[PDB]
Symmetry: D2
Subunit: 324 residues, 4 copies
């Protein structure tokens, strides 16, 4: 008899399928930051990692496994083959001319998405890879999943950055500074000035010129500084990781724990704000065990509405010319 048999008496060997499994596809700076944030928040009983670079994939898995003593995630697996991702509740995609840069990530998705749906037909897909709004659509089209199970990170990072900048200007914690950046993720995002508040006190009600070019204090600059901070981080360190990883982990917690919290995420915006094309844009969504179960119908000004419609037309102009 072995030491294991001399020390431990086994009652049953009958192993079960993972109950709260998360898969992260792409183990770059974003993927690894999502991985550590998820592990530290104790959201999964199993974590699966996938990439094309075999050596860095094995190294990253081993480095996470060596930290098991300080974690509450008993199983960390990795592999090039998607059989390691079987029965995942949530799949996070962070793998990465502009129409050709869209097609560059599109042909990458032509392989990933069918391999993901094959082993986890009932999962929720969380898209992080850029252009997030186009690639969420691509993931939705290739998977054949209903709209609720295909979620784009969208304006989650934009809103988090906005609330941080809002907090700094008012000397208040970002948790107490409410503000929504919607529509197209990145440069063309829309700050919803009417909803910007502290303790239910509307900033536009107190300051009617809020976000307008004629505002003396220039509060519009809070949104400008979101765009500019993103370029600054890239210029200074070459990439963004911690902020995105923490925001993705926040989305994952709502999904995994079925919290039904409202988050600014990219969803099929068809039928809203005069949009008829199959486009994904950020609106506040209620997140839970079925993914996007509901969405908040935000009252937008004519100007905000026009910006959303223009973004939709631009995204459908690229999407129209895509090979599947």
């Amino acid at each position: 008899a072995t030491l294991k048999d001399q020390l431990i008496y086994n009652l049953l060997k009958e192993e079960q399928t993972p109950q709260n499994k998360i898969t992260v596809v792409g183990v770059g700076a974003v993927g690894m930051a999502c991985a550590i944030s998820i592990l530290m928040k104790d959201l999964a009983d199993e974590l699966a990692l996938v990439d094309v670079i075999e050596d860095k994939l094995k190294g990253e898995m081993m480095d996470l496994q060596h930290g098991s003593l300080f974690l509450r995630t008993p199983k960390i697996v990795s592999g090039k083959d998607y059989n390691v991702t079987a029965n995942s509740k949530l799949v996070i995609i962070t793998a990465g001319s502009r129409l050709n840069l869209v097609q560059r990530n599109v042909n990458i998705f032509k392989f990933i998405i069918p391999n993901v749906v094959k082993y986890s037909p009932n999962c929720k897909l969380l898209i992080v890879s850029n252009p997030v709004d186009i690639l969420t659509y691509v993931a939705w089209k290739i998977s054949g999943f209903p709209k609720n199970r295909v979620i784009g990170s969208g304006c989650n990072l934009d809103s988090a950055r906005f609330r941080y900048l809002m907090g700094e200007r008012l000397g208040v914690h970002p948790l107490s500074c409410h503000g929504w950046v919607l529509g197209e993720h990145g440069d063309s995002s829309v700050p919803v000035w009417s909803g910007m508040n502290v303790a239910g006190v509307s900033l536009k009600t107190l300051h009617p010129d809020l976000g307008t070019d004629k505002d003396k204090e220039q509060w519009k600059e809070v949104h400008k500084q979101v765009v500019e901070s993103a370029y600054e981080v890239i210029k200074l360190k070459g990439y963004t990781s911690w902020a995105i990883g923490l925001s993705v982990a926040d989305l994952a917690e709502s999904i995994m724990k079925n919290l039904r919290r409202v988050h600014p995420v990219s969803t099929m915006i068809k039928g809203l704000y005069g949009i008829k094309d199959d486009v994904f844009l950020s609106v506040p969504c209620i997140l839970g065990q079925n993914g996007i179960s509901d969405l908040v119908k935000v009252t937008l000004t004519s100007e905000e509405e026009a910006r959303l419609k223009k973004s939709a037309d631009t995204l459908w102009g690229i999407q129209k010319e895509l090979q599947f």
Copy 2:
């Protein structure tokens, strides 16, 4: 007249000193992994980051600040000047070249350590930079701090790796697999076979060949795999970050919360195991608000004791020829 003044009525604007401040010196792969693990564990009310590369430093600080909405650390500061580190309770040194490593790192410590003690004379110093055992001694000599306030990461990562491997062989969580790797961090570490247990059941008592060359089960391979895995991770991804960052955060928690938990850390071992020189080696230490307040006197075999004495002689041989 401002929106801030119209929205917020100020009661007082006297500034207080941070109560639970942590400083991380060196924002490389190790330093950043320590930062994120401390942030996600809510150990500090303020986090300061220091480095020589200004661009990378600003980028890393900004990336952490953009994630504030998902954290409970209201202040994140960075700078080349140590005035940003003022009144830190714990200072974590992860700087240097990732023996010539000794030479380069001593010279680097010659300037870091006096700048640290200048702004935080009452802090605890936690050394991560390699060779961790020599550099903990160097930090102790330059600072002039008492023994208890100078802590080396030492065999904390070695023991965590060992318990992970132990857990995998027995099908038990590493938290329930007890085992101590002591002495010199790295290649020359000592596994304490007599203390290896599950639920107080000694493994060497059940299996006398444990750790011997005549063991058919080859349990001696468990300690060799700790050494092998470290080289494998480096070969595969180029560095180690997550495992070390999580282990350092576990030490930080015991210090910050005054837990008085026992950890394998590098301390002044002069007066134990026939050692008469000023050398730092890993032994189980009680960690709290005063740093190392106490140490556990582990009963070692003649073989284990000889390995510790040999390590001490080698470390002193390098140390006695160093210039301060």
Copy 3:
């Protein structure tokens, strides 16, 4: 040599003053619920418990100490003497005397004022630099009492106030909309309890004002009867008392949320009772709930909420009633 000396080599035996100490005064249902919430949220390196009933006090301390293996608070102390509370960063007062049928509201206040005139001087004696968090009812009057007896600046005297009222309101709001209360924003202000004021204009989800979409929100003409959401806050409080005899978990969790902002210097906004003199036409030394920024100095700042004239009149009426009792208080 002892087993301890044979096993452990001591480097230094000197113990530092506690760094993040919390004291809970009154170990009744509320106090104990505040204690377990603070312990489970790891907000303190030291927890001190005080009461007048020595046996119950020792029992409660021992029961908490027996759970130390599952906690991250290395020291739990208790005692009748306030020397156990020395150097506390935050002192939570939950000591009180319940409502007795056949007494005036002034008489009820005075009995609790009698309880405080021993506690407050003993608290400031051992923790002159602490923050005082008052839970005992009538919370608005007793926060004033604590402020007057202590001699502390306004920022270091905090009343629980409308923190439980808002938490209850947001739960009920969440239920109606099928959304988590964290995402359902709403503020109940003024006097804690029966006379609280729901601020309809601030009620929102994702920055979308409910009053803007539905102008009859909080009006008696409302077809959807959203005004009954605030009435259910009042009703649920009486229902809980009728059903189990007291309230503990909800208040303990809300107090822990306040403690977290103070202990960690978060600067989060909370509806807490503060010295409202100089706002909403209130010219008296009264404590009412308004949204306050809470940190290491207690209330460092307050949010100037725009109120309708009827919300302002309700606040002024509450202030007059509280001052009417306060002026007749002997201490």
Copy 4:
């Protein structure tokens, strides 16, 4: 159109994934509830009792604290339909041979109602005499022994490690020690396993656990027994310590951690014990309940104490009607 419909556009209006049920909302039950809620172990918490008013009050009080919790649904009821598809069921209902039979009659109604709605659950028995009632739950349910867990010596060990920690000035997490066998007065401290950093205390101090010992380390176990009576005399019941220990068990089960805990299990087949009795041994706890057990090397004296406890428990068990 309602305000809800004007504000929120519904995509779909389509069961609990990590549900926990607590049976008996007394001091123990409520302490288990708050500990589980604060540890974020369940997405749904179901509460059951016979006293309808107290039950509704306790459920409401927990619901009013939702803003500070990460458990979106708290339900209660006299009917067990509220407990449907629970992953873990915690039984805390009961009196704080004649009395044992009255507690069997209570379990004759609870246990069939629990398995009816949660046939795949893990049963965690807290109610006293915990070792006898664990057997009772196992017999009535028909569940395999891995899915019937008794709290057993989990509180005894926690108390012991606290007392060990106080004597050595070390955190109980770093003070290892196992109290096994029968929960309560007749528990067995395993002196050979008592250690700090893998350093055996019995090796350094041979008199450890004997009357001869000048340092009287045997009092560490005797003060566990004494403290239990003291807490009862002082406050009338024990709640926080037991509630925190149950949440610790619940965490290893819910998250499939495979951590070792001192819990009551079917001990028949070990230490010459032939009768169907449940005693505490270190068990590996996970998603299947007790998947494995640690075979502790016990001295002749310790082994005899377990066998004697088994004979006493069987003596009571054989005379039971159910």
